Design a protein around this ligand. Structure first.
Ligand SMILES: OC[C@H]1O[C@H](O[C@H]2O[C@H](CO)[C@@H](O)[C@H](O)[C@H]2O)[C@H](O)[C@@H](O)[C@@H]1O
Ligand SMILES: OC[C@H]1O[C@H](O[C@H]2O[C@H](CO)[C@@H](O)[C@H](O)[C@H]2O)[C@H](O)[C@@H](O)[C@@H]1O
Lengths: 243, 239
C-alpha cells in the first residue's frame, strides 16, 4: 500500500487539474513542484532562463529581466525533510508534481544524502520521497496548444493579459523543448522499467472524477472523495519550423 | 505600490481553507500553505492524541494513536527561506495561513533570525514573510458547527468513519473559543485592523472576498450534522 504519489509531467500539460483536484480531497497530500527551484537562485526558472540560448532580441524583450536570487544552502537531508513534511496530509500521504526539466536537479540534490540508495532518477525519487510513490503521467498530444499556453504564461508570469505577444521563433523554441521532455520521460520509463499510471489530458479533462478516484484508490483512499475561447496563435503558428 | 504578501489569520475549519484555495487557483496569489503548523519534535501537524492532551479514556479511544515523525533540524534562516520561496508565485506574490494556536511556534521559531526586527508576533510575521502582509481574518461565528467539523476531522484525519461524543466537543468548542479570543485581543494589542470576512459571507459570496484580496495585492478582481445532536439541552456543556 503506497503512501505517496508523484505526478510526472510537463509545464501546462494538465497535471494541475488532476493534482489540485487531488489536494481538495484532503487525503492526497499537498502536491507542489517541490523540485522546480534552481539551486543558484532558489527560484523557479525565470523567463529569460527558459530562453537562455535565444539571442533573438525581439523575443528577449518580451520577457522580464532576471532577478538574481541566492544559493539554496540547505543540506541535502534538510532539503529532503522539509519536502517530506510540507507535502504530506495529516493522514500521512504525500504528493507532488515533477516536470521532466527538473529531473537532473533532483538527482543532483539527492547525490549527497546519506544512504542514497542508487545513483539514478528512480532511487532519487525513492530516497527523497522516503517511499515508493505511485507514479502518474499526464501528457498532451497537441504540443502547439501547449507551447502556446506556455509562451503566453512565461510573458505574463501566470501559469494558471495585455502584454502577451505572438512570436513564431519562440513558440518553435518552446515546442522543440516540450517535445524533448517527452522523449525524456519516454526514454526513462523504458530505461528503468517503469509503468506509470499513464493518462493524457483529453481523457483527463473528460473523466476527472474517474482518475481522481483511481489515484485515490491506489493510495488506499475511498474513491468516494473525488469531486465533480480559441487560440489564434495555434492556428497562426501552424501556417508559419517544428511541431 | 503593491503589498506583495498576505496572511489569512484564522482557526481550524473556518472559511480559512476555502478562501485560500480559491486564491491559489488564481495563479497570482502564491501557494498559501499552513507553513506555521508543524511541530518541532515531530515535524508534522498536531495529531489527535496531541490536541486532546488535558484526562478521559472516553476520547483517547476515538483518537488514532501518536505517530512520532522526526526532529525539525532546519536552522531558522533556511526555514524562512523555504517558506518564502514555496509560498510565492512567479509574479512574486506570497500567500499563507496562520492560526492562533500556531502563533507561539512562529515566534519561538523567529527568535533565531539574524535580523530580528522586534520581539512580538507582528514583527515575527514581517521578518518571516520578508514584507508587510495584507491581513485577512476569517471567522465562522457559529462555534457549534465549527467545533463539529473539527471533531469529525480530528478523528477522520480528513480536514476538508467515526462518531459524535459530547464531552470532547466541549474541549473543542472552548479551545476554539480561547483561540478566537487571542486574535481579537491581538488585533488591538498591536493595533492591527485586518480585513474581516465571515464564513456565511464566504460560503455564499466568496467571489467578492477573493476579488477583494486580489485588489489589495494589486492584481485583477476579474481573475478568480450532529449539530442539533449537540444543540446537550441537559448537561451544561459550554456553547
Ligand atoms: O492538526 C491537524 C492539522 O489539520 C488542519 O489542516 C490540514 O488540512 C489542510 C488540507 O486539507 C492543510 O492545509 C493542512 O496541511 C493540514 O494540516 C489544520 O488546518 C491545522 O491547523 C492542523 O495542523
Ligand atoms: O516557469 C516557472 C515555473 O512556472 C510554472 O509553475 C508555476 O505555476 C503554478 C502556478 O499556480 C505553480 O503551481 C508553481 O508554483 C509555479 O512555479 C511551471 O509549472 C514550472 O515548472 C516552473 O517552475
Amino acid at each position: 500500500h503506497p503512501t505517496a504519489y508523484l505526478v510526472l509531467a510537463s509545464q501546462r500539460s494538465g497535471s494541475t487539474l488532476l493534482v489540485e483536484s487531488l489536494r481538495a480531497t484532503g487525503v492526497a497530500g499537498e502536491p507542489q513542484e517541490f523540485f522546480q527551484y534552481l539551486p543558484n537562485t532558489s527560484m523557479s526558472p525565470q523567463p529569460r532562463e527558459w530562453f537562455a540560448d535565444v539571442e533573438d532580441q525581439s523575443i528577449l524583450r518580451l520577457l522580464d529581466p532576471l532577478i538574481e536570487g541566492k544559493p539554496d544552502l540547505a543540506p541535502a537531508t534538510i532539503w529532503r525533510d522539509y519536502i517530506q513534511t510540507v507535502g504530506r496530509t495529516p493522514n500521512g500521504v504525500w504528493g507532488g508534481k515533477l516536470m521532466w526539466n527538473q529531473t537532473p536537479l533532483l538527482v543532483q540534490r539527492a547525490k549527497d544524502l546519506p544512504d542514497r540508495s542508487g545513483s539514478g532518477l528512480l532511487s532519487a525519487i525513492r530516497d527523497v520521497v522516503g517511499s515508493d510513490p505511485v507514479l502518474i503521467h499526464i501528457h498532451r498530444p497537441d504540443v502547439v496548444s501547449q507551447a502556446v499556453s506556455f509562451w503566453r504564461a512565461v510573458q505574463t508570469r501566470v501559469w494558471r493579459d495585455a502584454r502577451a505577444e505572438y512570436h513564431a521563433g519562440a513558440i518553435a523554441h518552446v515546442i522543440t523543448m516540450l517535445r524533448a521532455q517527452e522523449e525524456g520521460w519516454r526514454a526513462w520509463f523504458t530505461e528503468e522499467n517503469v509503468e506509470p499510471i499513464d493518462v493524457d489530458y483529453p481523457y483527463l479533462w473528460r473523466n476527472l472524477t474517474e482518475v481522481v478516484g483511481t489515484v485515490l484508490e491506489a493510495l488506499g483512499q475511498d474513491p468516494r472523495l473525488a469531486p465533480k475561447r480559441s487560440d489564434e496563435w495555434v492556428e497562426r503558428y501552424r501556417r508559419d519550423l517544428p511541431l
